Scaffold this active site. Structure first.
Site, PDB file in Angstrom:
ATOM      1  N   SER A  62       0.807  -1.217   0.000  1.00 48.05           N
ATOM      2  CA  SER A  62       0.000   0.000   0.000  1.00 48.05           C
ATOM      3  C   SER A  62       0.841   1.270   0.000  1.00 48.05           C
ATOM      4  O   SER A  62       0.294   2.393  -0.052  1.00 48.05           O
ATOM      5  CB  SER A  62      -0.957   0.000   1.196  1.00 48.05           C
ATOM      6  OG  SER A  62      -0.246   0.011   2.424  1.00 48.05           O
ATOM      7  N   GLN A  75      -9.143  -2.316   3.800  1.00 45.51           N
ATOM      8  CA  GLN A  75      -8.016  -1.613   3.242  1.00 45.51           C
ATOM      9  C   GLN A  75      -8.393  -0.856   1.959  1.00 45.51           C
ATOM     10  O   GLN A  75      -7.775   0.170   1.638  1.00 45.51           O
ATOM     11  CB  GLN A  75      -6.894  -2.603   2.980  1.00 45.51           C
ATOM     12  CG  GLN A  75      -5.613  -2.021   2.421  1.00 45.51           C
ATOM     13  CD  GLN A  75      -4.562  -3.096   2.274  1.00 45.51           C
ATOM     14  OE1 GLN A  75      -4.269  -3.811   3.233  1.00 45.51           O
ATOM     15  NE2 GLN A  75      -4.007  -3.241   1.061  1.00 45.51           N
ATOM     16  N   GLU A  92     -15.268  20.867 -18.981  1.00 43.61           N
ATOM     17  CA  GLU A  92     -15.454  19.536 -19.508  1.00 43.61           C
ATOM     18  C   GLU A  92     -14.788  18.505 -18.616  1.00 43.61           C
ATOM     19  O   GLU A  92     -15.381  17.464 -18.352  1.00 43.61           O
ATOM     20  CB  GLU A  92     -14.917  19.432 -20.917  1.00 43.61           C
ATOM     21  CG  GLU A  92     -15.660  20.356 -21.822  1.00 43.61           C
ATOM     22  CD  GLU A  92     -15.379  20.095 -23.273  1.00 43.61           C
ATOM     23  OE1 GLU A  92     -14.234  19.700 -23.611  1.00 43.61           O
ATOM     24  OE2 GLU A  92     -16.329  20.303 -24.074  1.00 43.61           O
ATOM     25  N   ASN A 124      -5.270  -2.538  13.878  1.00 44.64           N
ATOM     26  CA  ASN A 124      -6.666  -2.288  13.520  1.00 44.64           C
ATOM     27  C   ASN A 124      -7.182  -0.917  13.937  1.00 44.64           C
ATOM     28  O   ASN A 124      -7.733  -0.210  13.112  1.00 44.64           O
ATOM     29  CB  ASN A 124      -7.590  -3.406  14.015  1.00 44.64           C
ATOM     30  CG  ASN A 124      -7.398  -4.697  13.254  1.00 44.64           C
ATOM     31  OD1 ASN A 124      -6.680  -4.745  12.247  1.00 44.64           O
ATOM     32  ND2 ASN A 124      -8.037  -5.751  13.717  1.00 44.64           N
ATOM     33  N   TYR A 144     -13.106  -6.341  11.838  1.00 40.24           N
ATOM     34  CA  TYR A 144     -12.160  -6.019  10.770  1.00 40.24           C
ATOM     35  C   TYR A 144     -11.917  -7.157   9.755  1.00 40.24           C
ATOM     36  O   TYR A 144     -11.778  -8.326  10.118  1.00 40.24           O
ATOM     37  CB  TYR A 144     -10.814  -5.578  11.371  1.00 40.24           C
ATOM     38  CG  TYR A 144      -9.790  -5.219  10.309  1.00 40.24           C
ATOM     39  CD1 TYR A 144      -9.741  -3.938   9.770  1.00 40.24           C
ATOM     40  CD2 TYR A 144      -8.916  -6.178   9.804  1.00 40.24           C
ATOM     41  CE1 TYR A 144      -8.842  -3.613   8.762  1.00 40.24           C
ATOM     42  CE2 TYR A 144      -8.020  -5.866   8.807  1.00 40.24           C
ATOM     43  CZ  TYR A 144      -7.975  -4.580   8.302  1.00 40.24           C
ATOM     44  OH  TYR A 144      -7.061  -4.267   7.313  1.00 40.24           O
ATOM     45  N   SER A 181      -7.704  27.215 -30.523  1.00 37.64           N
ATOM     46  CA  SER A 181      -7.427  26.476 -31.739  1.00 37.64           C
ATOM     47  C   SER A 181      -5.935  26.644 -32.079  1.00 37.64           C
ATOM     48  O   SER A 181      -5.340  27.682 -31.746  1.00 37.64           O
ATOM     49  CB  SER A 181      -8.313  27.068 -32.840  1.00 37.64           C
ATOM     50  OG  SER A 181      -8.046  26.490 -34.096  1.00 37.64           O
ATOM     51  N   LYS A 195      -9.534   3.287   1.488  1.00 36.85           N
ATOM     52  CA  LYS A 195      -8.643   4.439   1.345  1.00 36.85           C
ATOM     53  C   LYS A 195      -8.547   5.002  -0.064  1.00 36.85           C
ATOM     54  O   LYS A 195      -8.778   6.190  -0.264  1.00 36.85           O
ATOM     55  CB  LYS A 195      -7.236   4.099   1.858  1.00 36.85           C
ATOM     56  CG  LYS A 195      -7.023   4.428   3.327  1.00 36.85           C
ATOM     57  CD  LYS A 195      -5.773   3.738   3.871  1.00 36.85           C
ATOM     58  CE  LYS A 195      -6.026   3.214   5.277  1.00 36.85           C
ATOM     59  NZ  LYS A 195      -7.002   2.091   5.265  1.00 36.85           N
ATOM     60  N   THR A 224     -35.368  27.013 -18.617  1.00 38.37           N
ATOM     61  CA  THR A 224     -35.822  25.716 -18.160  1.00 38.37           C
ATOM     62  C   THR A 224     -35.856  24.879 -19.416  1.00 38.37           C
ATOM     63  O   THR A 224     -36.368  25.342 -20.433  1.00 38.37           O
ATOM     64  CB  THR A 224     -37.223  25.725 -17.507  1.00 38.37           C
ATOM     65  OG1 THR A 224     -38.164  26.320 -18.401  1.00 38.37           O
ATOM     66  CG2 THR A 224     -37.230  26.476 -16.168  1.00 38.37           C
TER      67      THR A 224
END
Lengths: 462, 450, 454, 450
Positions: free
Chosen positions: C11, C311, C279, C99, C306, C266, C314, C144
């Site tokens: 990790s 893991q 975008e 843990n 656990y 461009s 994260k 709208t």
């Protein structure tokens, strides 16, 4: 300059930072060099380069390729992407003059689409290889333990006894269908966008069919806007990867539960697990497989959400197409050989599995069934079964231990031949149609799996 | 059974749709039992009689699920008993299993359902092909980033939406090969101990094969995830079309005028159907993400969680069955404002690119081809004309290679004609492309039929 | 450990970001041991100095993970032992568990992370408010369905994107309250058997409280899912702002001009601008929805306590934060540097006789029945089209000919400025209301950053 | 309106649940019109009585939607007009607007729905607490990786599923503050020009405040997304409890025996409720993902895509309304096999950990504490005894630090008792934790009321 787009001045710090992809896209380099060689041949066959110019570019690219391959050419801290890095590197080797000549008739939009496809076609084959390793580990465990019998589970409750081999192989079939999906995917991936330009088609008189053939594709696109805009091939790859991950999580879950103290079906190997005494081994690989399947589902859902409601044609949102697919491939490249090693490393406690197979009177089902094929109606077969259980329960014995006096005392239909299915061996033997758990059937199944796998492998090779 | 358990497990409000297939499955099983010698020629016929009585009453609307019924199977067994009595109808319960039934019934349903979806997809493809064919000469701005790049034919753009849809039909065809495997004969999980023939039964029920592993056949739902994927893909593809229509229909663009029967609403018209298409595609992504999440980390073999296979797939099909004909009708109904699109196609000196690429073709190095092009824009800006309106001397003053022949690409018609390789926007290429879509569509239709 | 296992479990390529938090947890655990009488004053000071040394080398990047380190924690143990020997270093292992440490560090990291995100959000909101304040009187068509409806103040449209972002800040505040619960002291599952004080430890580490249940504290990750959710929500709000900008910047709309430094042009025309940032925002919102969906799928159906699956909590959260830290300043700069073409917007606001609605509303306000009012408004429109004229240029004789109710007083709403001024209830686009709205946003923002500081 | 458009827009098969709220809004609006002086006292009261009568007919099922009704609001306009005639009926249309009304009804409905879900959540927490209170002494293996780690109190494990549910309740409370802002008076987009008081209407309708921006009030749906998330988060928390129950009730664990009324069925009982909980959590995850995908990249202000906000949330709520009482009942019905659990709790020499930790508490360096425990296990494994049965001599052989006092942690009871800091499994801490759950639950309940 940014993505070949221009500024009167330059991009702001924050935009420069947002634009960067060199920390993941460098794996596109060799494909980019390949495409460049092909574009060289295009400009030559279009009389746009002399023999020496062509030779000049080809040597430029070879040198560049050697330097990329040995790790001595890399991106500067200022290249937005691998394409800008490679252009800069070629011009370093061949001069503004000749390098510039190559840029002619080139567009980023068809290039980026083509490179992603070329990379994907190699990636699904690396993933296919990992899939075959897991199928292989399952099939070799099945062949190594062809007679172990375990409780078959539904809802995690014991139902009919099955061959352990039959259960193992049940994990291989979804994996074979994922290979079949990869084969089907490859045919749609094998279409080249080169010649599409920015969106409207090339105005140099190039031949998209020849370029396609140059690069490994089976065909060239039918529509330049579609070729540059669409990313459903990336979405489909992402789906097939999520599907594989989900199929691994199902196997992962079996191993996790099989590994618990309470089940005791399997003992994990020390090299393929972690971790109270040496009796405490964690199925960490299986747990990671479980967790990563979530992540790959997320890659897929995110990619579809990224594609949704985008107007034609190319948009910068399509820069987001690659990371989710790259992530899915990278995780599977780690997961598939870990899972194959895990599966191959497993030790099965077949005594433990054999003692559990007949628990809670599961063979009562086989009794009732036996009676049905004599000619007893369902209701009577099931009343007789319930009774024989009650009898064996009150006498504290197994259904097999029941004497003929008692069998006949439950029903005249209960000939002593019923005992042939009142053992786990016998029960399993009775299930002898295609796909059933009888030894004769599972042996032919394992064989059909070997064939399908070799057939699928050969379909991918082409 | 507690009220809460009963409420949680009632499925009749969505599974009734499986009733015709259950009856077909029941007919096949009657035959299985007969061939097993567990039914007399007489018993068989009574049962086959009762199943037609139940079938007619089901297609009538006269036989319905009772609030009392747990699922479709319960309702129909009850309804069978009430036509042949507890004695005979109970004889059918022999040698049958819920786990393989339910997987089989869902696959049969799905195989009908993808064909209905296929039909709707073909409608949208025809609608787009029709509008493309009806507009042989209309030219529009080709957009990247919603900014005008090269001029394209409107037909080329419309056809760009047909191709993903054809790849979706190709996916449906591939899906159907995996769907056409029968689990019947797998029993609860371990295989039947009758001596039935799953192969015969597969052919009876309309499958191409029987399953190779009874555990897999009853536990796996990846066919359902794959179906959900294809539906989500079709919807994502419709959402891209929907987005184009929505933007085209805006006051500021004015590329299309909407039909009153296909919009709501002065001359203000809302692209409602396209809006719903965009929104519903998220829902179909959700159905798919949810379904894979449901299948994740399930141990073998069958678990009650797999009952959650049906509803997201039912929902996706039902959504597309509404969306496809509505999108097809929205596309067919549009009126394209061809003059408006043509006047916008060369705006912002987009043809400067075609000038630069004409130079490149002449032999001019890429860097100076672009300098010339940029210079040409500058000259035309100052004068306030367009590129083709530059005099020969002005042109020559920017570059010697800039002969009067460059004007062939300084109109939108000229620009579009120059792009004549396969897949390009040139009328001649687009006509072939249009023609090839028809042939591709008939080929995929024929593959599904077989 | 097989090669495949070790590659799979490594990790350090993402978790290194927890290093300074791990060091903080080590200084605090040192104190725990000292307070339990398991360390002497000298050992405590040797450990503390070892950890200071290691903090220095982590901070300057001279200390780093080896290919051989499983994760950040293993690497830090190695590094400490390098600086105080196996003798002293070993003493710190006492009473330590992975843990509860992992859960604590992730939470400490998240609390800083949401604060960098909040700062990013406050900059976008500030960029929107600055643009609103700079155009207090420009009017634009209100959309709208991408169709022009009622005219609105540009400022009112901009501020409409600030409100969801203030709600997202409000959600970070709610999130922070649940995140500030310390799992330290929960051990592997069952609770520490040392006589340590979880509430003391919580405070050392900057938490507000200590967990009520050791199994929950080590096994639960609904705090990471909530963060992921809040991150996806912010990205979705950005994407709606992005979509507006993309459409506004098209040739056909021409509402905004994009600044040179914030968008690509461009090759031939550096000033024909693509809205790349908008975008990318749109595209990245998909990715962050996917991070959320994946994480919840990861947490689904996990038995207690656990499991190694956790893991996987994260990386999706790290990704979401990293993406927003890039995207938020990109978007802030993009919005702050837009040029609005107020003249083009004001010419289009009354397009297609949108002001017919304001006429109908005016009649209904005089007691004219609904259907009659609309029949009247449609008549005014036809009279006006037929005569090539805007509604306000219909004479008194023409108005009175459509209805006796249509008096010359109606002209107060047949101007876009007058249409706008009539919408003067709370939340309306009238300039008085919008000015108050703009004031309240600033005060709401100040209020929310005070709340984070605490 | 074409058939395809009509079928696609029709929302009455799911929007009917909004009828009572639509009627409430119509009452509120009658009062707005009255305060604007556009209704006479007698007109006001004719409408109110019309609305009351329609409300009753709606509640009893005597008024329903026709195939012809686009949506609930249209069905109710129809029914109002049937009751008070077209003329008084039509005065109600004055000054009203679809966009602010649909956002208001949805919010009103959600705020009731989160309270029903909250009541379900309190039921599961109650069922967990009751089972914990009923087991003050039962000890089990604490699991990590589904491997036996430290012994824990069964009550401690059960309460570990209560805490995520209290955090979800807390999330509901936080959600409600945002949901409680009224959009009514925003008009279609720009604000009402009728001179109404949005603060007065908000009170009428039951909200705490009125929106600060009409465009945001009509366009934004992050409240729907937040609700979708809380619901998915509850479903995920339920699925972890479900997974535990599914594992516990397998023959191999034997930790619980299922009750016949709360499972399906030799003497094999299936944990169906638990399995359905697990599968439906995927579905609820999908509802959230899809909804966020629907919201993504929508330009302001209102667009018809936003109609798709409702069905995912309705579905999420409906599912949790079935699941929660079923899970509560399921948990209340379990029989825990305490002897089986106690017998497994020390297995595999897990108390070695407690031994080592005791040595660390003495002063023994970590590495020695561990080699000692490793030695003790070796000694006991050879002898075939538990750590507790090793004599005073063989304990001193392993280490002088390892005095007979160590036996205080070599029973499961002794192990569990040492874990006596806040949140630990020591019986005295768990009793405090249980009490605190009651306090938190009541505190949360109160925050939700009125």
């Amino acid at each position: 300059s940014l993505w070949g787009g221009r500024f009167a001045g330059g991009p702001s710090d924050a935009l420069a930072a947002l634009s960067k992809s060199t920390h993941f896209d460098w794996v596109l380099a060799p494909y980019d060099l390949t495409a460049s060689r092909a574009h060289t041949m295009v400009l030559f066959r279009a009389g746009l380069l002399t023999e020496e110019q062509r030779d000049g570019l080809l040597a430029g690219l070879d040198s560049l390729a050697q330097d990329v391959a040995d790790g001595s050419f890399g991106p500067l801290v200022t290249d937005e992407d691998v394409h800008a890095a490679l252009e800069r590197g070629l011009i370093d080797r061949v001069g503004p003059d000749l390098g510039g000549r190559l840029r002619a008739g080139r567009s980023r939009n068809d290039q980026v689409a083509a490179l992603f496809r070329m990379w994907l076609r190699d990636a699904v084959r690396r993933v296919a290889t990992g899939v075959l390793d897991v199928v292989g580990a399952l099939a070799e465990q099945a062949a190594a333990h062809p007679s172990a019998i375990m409780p078959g589970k539904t809802h995690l409750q014991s139902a009919q006894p099955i061959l352990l081999a039959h259960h193992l192989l049940a994990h291989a079939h979804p994996l074979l269908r994922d290979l079949d999906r990869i084969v089907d995917f490859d045919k749609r991936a094998a279409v080249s966008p080169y010649g599409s330009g920015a969106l409207a088609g090339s105005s140099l008189g190039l031949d998209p069919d020849a370029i396609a053939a140059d690069l490994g594709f089976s065909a060239a696109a039918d529509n330049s806007v579609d070729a540059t805009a669409a990313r459903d091939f990336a979405a489909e790859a992402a789906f097939v990867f999520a599907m594989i991950a989900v199929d691994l999580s199902r196997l992962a879950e079996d191993i996790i539960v099989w590994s618990s103290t309470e089940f005791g079906y399997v003992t994990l190997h020390d090299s393929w697990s972690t971790g109270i005494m040496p009796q405490k081994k964690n199925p960490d690989i299986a747990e990671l497989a479980r967790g990563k399947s979530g992540r790959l589902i997320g890659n897929l859902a995110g990619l579809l959400a990224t594609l949704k409601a985008q107007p034609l044609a190319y948009n910068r949102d399509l820069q987001e197409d690659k990371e989710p697919v790259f992530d899915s491939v990278a995780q599977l490249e780690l997961l598939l050989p870990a899972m194959a090693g895990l599966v191959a490393s497993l030790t099965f406690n077949v005594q433990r599995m054999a003692e559990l197979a007949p628990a809670g009177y599961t063979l009562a089902t086989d009794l009732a069934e036996w009676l049905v094929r004599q000619g007893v109606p369902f209701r009577s077969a099931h009343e007789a079964a319930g009774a024989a259980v009650r009898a064996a329960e009150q006498r504290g014995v197994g259904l097999q231990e029941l004497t003929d006096d008692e069998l006949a005392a439950i029903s005249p239909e209960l000939t002593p031949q019923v005992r042939e299915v009142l053992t786990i061996e016998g029960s399993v033997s009775a299930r002898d149609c295609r796909g059933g758990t009888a030894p004769g059937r599972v042996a032919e199944q394992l064989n059909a799996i070997g064939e399908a796998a070799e057939r699928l492998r050969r379909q991918l090779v082409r």
